[PDB]
Design a protein around this ligand. Structure first.
Ligand SMILES: NC(=O)c1ccc[n+]([C@@H]2O[C@H](COP(=O)([O-])OP(=O)(O)OC[C@H]3O[C@@H](n4cnc5c(N)ncnc54)[C@H](O)[C@@H]3O)[C@@H](O)[C@H]2O)c1
Ligand SMILES: [Cl-]
Ligand code: NA
Ligand SMILES: [Zn+2]
Ligand SMILES: [Zn+2]
Lengths: 310, 314
């Protein structure tokens, strides 16, 4: 079973965490041809360390690697350090830039440690903010798509009060979300996606003017551009039908609830802006087991299978 | 075995619809003792008609019945008529009043037809509004609880714009919703539930990082409920709490927060309880089915399921 069919960047995350170890364990499971499609971004010293502990030194010769987030001192597994935090952001930044320039088609970031990044004096509020910052766009133009249990749901807004989200919603914002999400769908192996747009208000207002001002004009424009788009519709109703390859959530909770319920441990979070698709694996850096050789690479392999489709 | 363990009122709905027919088919499946706990409200003429079509005349002689929503003309199955609309509201009103007075412990309303009611000149926007109107309370003090697939979710607000819902949210509104929902839980066979309150904003505002609403509304409300001795968690992010699945009752601030989980897990299976004062009123999960009324082919499964839910052992 080949799971990688396109070029991918893998940023190895916090070099003191389990990110290095799971990168190797993942790459080990792949064939030689698959390995050559994955470019690893991170400090060599950490990959060396993990390879020694896990006894996978012979794998290192086959890795395609680019030095990023170099360390000035030896790797200290399990230790939260500002240096490690800087490393994480640099590795991820270099992967993103490689996707931006067309060297790879998508990026996977191994687990970061939020405290490490903060201690380096780096502002970080998630991959959507980082991706925007690196690509030099506004946070408004990078969207989060959750993928889990068959469902794909792009969020037009995220991480702000409901009132604040309502004030920012516009037809253009919804259109930009869908364009970004449709291009990502192509990458996930769905060329002609059937799109469903959630209503802002219950039953898509059939209960306020917001949908007539926002979601209705947006769907009209998308359809004129030749997209197959239904809605606005009541979130609850459309989801239940299970007739669509992509759903467009207006609000955080509309999109987050379905995914956490159906896919408690199988959900991917894709950050999407410009040409770039960045997934995390859905777990932390596990400092209590780092350097002890007990980390499993299942979540990383799942992320690779999803982004590596075709 | 027994699915009915307390007294219920059954309002038979639009008498031209399938409501009469499914009431009989349901009662047929129950034992004699169970049948004697269900008091049927509606026009006798419609039950007679349905009994003839379904060949259940001998069942009618056992039925506990109160005349409500009498008709002035023969039943015309399948036909939308104002008279039928008036009938529906009268039957349902009489069942509600029987629950209000303590004659029954809960109410089931069989399917109505919205057009019929409107043509009778009667304002109707759902059972929450009717229940409020009959009990003489405001629509703000009657709440909708969805039940399906182990989930129970009461909605603090319901069928209104998000903006409108946000403007009405207050600590007291949240408290009233929970009180109503807790008393209903007792009736559903879970006394003293473990309650989870959803946040208004994502992540329950994460303190105050994503708006002040939760600090002003859900936090003081939970504090008050806990001081009164209730086991209540939150506010928490809706998505997060639901995923845990370790609470008997959830409190949704907004329509979609509560409706999405239920339709996902229980695509058909979900009951909608209107709760006001001491009265709990469920619908059956379907319409009056005018196209098949009076042909004897309607399924009673949804009614039986509603009876099992409201009829549960204390
Ligand atoms: N309560 C109401 O508001 C109500 C009732 C009847 C009709 N209507 C009007 O007609 C539309 C559709 O309503 P509907 O009556 O078709 O119901 P529905 O949408 O709830 O159910 C779909 C169809 O399934 C069948 N069905 C439903 N319950 C059944 C049962 N117990 N046994 C066998 N078959 C059953 C009927 O043919 C029904 O038409 C509504 O959108 C409305 O405009 C409304
Ligand atoms: Cl490559
Ligand atoms: Na911190
Ligand atoms: Zn979130
Ligand atoms: Zn509804």
């Amino acid at each position: 079973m080949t799971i990688v069919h396109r070029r991918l960047a893998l940023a190895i995350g916090d070099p003191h965490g389990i990110g290095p170890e799971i990168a190797l364990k993942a790459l080990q499971q792949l064939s030689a041809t698959e390995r050559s499609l994955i470019k690893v971004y991170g400090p060599w010293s950490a990959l060396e360390q993990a390879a020694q502990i896990c006894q996978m030194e012979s794998l290192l010769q086959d890795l395609i690697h680019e030095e990023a987030g170099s360390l000035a001192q030896p790797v200290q597994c399990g230790e939260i350090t500002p240096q490690a935090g800087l490393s994480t952001v640099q590795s991820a930044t270099a992967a993103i830039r490689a996707c931006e320039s067309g060297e790879v088609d998508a990026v996977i970031a191994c687990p970061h440690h939020e405290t490490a990044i903060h201690r380096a004096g780096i502002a970080f509020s998630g991959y959507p903010s980082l991706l925007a910052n690196v690509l030099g766009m506004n946070e408004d133009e990078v969207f989060l798509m959750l993928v889990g249990a068959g469902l794909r749901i792009v969020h037009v807004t995220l991480h702000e009060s409901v009132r604040s989200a309502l004030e920012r919603l516009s037809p253009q914002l919804v259109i930009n979300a869908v364009d970004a999400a449709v291009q990502t769908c192509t990458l996930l192996g769905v060329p002609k996606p059937q799109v469903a747009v959630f209503g802002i208000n219950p039953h898509a207002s059939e209960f306020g003017l917001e949908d007539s001002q926002i979601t209705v004009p947006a769907v009209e424009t998308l359809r004129k551009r030749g997209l197959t788009v239904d809605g606005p519709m009541g979130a609850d109703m459309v989801l239940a039908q299970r007739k669509h390859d992509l759903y467009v959530a207006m609000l955080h909770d509309q999109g987050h609830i379905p995914i956490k319920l159906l896919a408690p441990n199988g959900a991917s979070a894709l950050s999407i802006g410009g040409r770039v698709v960045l997934s995390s694996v859905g777990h932390g850096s596990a400092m209590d087991i780092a350097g002890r050789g007990v980390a499993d690479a299942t979540a990383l392999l799942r992320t690779i299978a999803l982004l590596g489709a075709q």
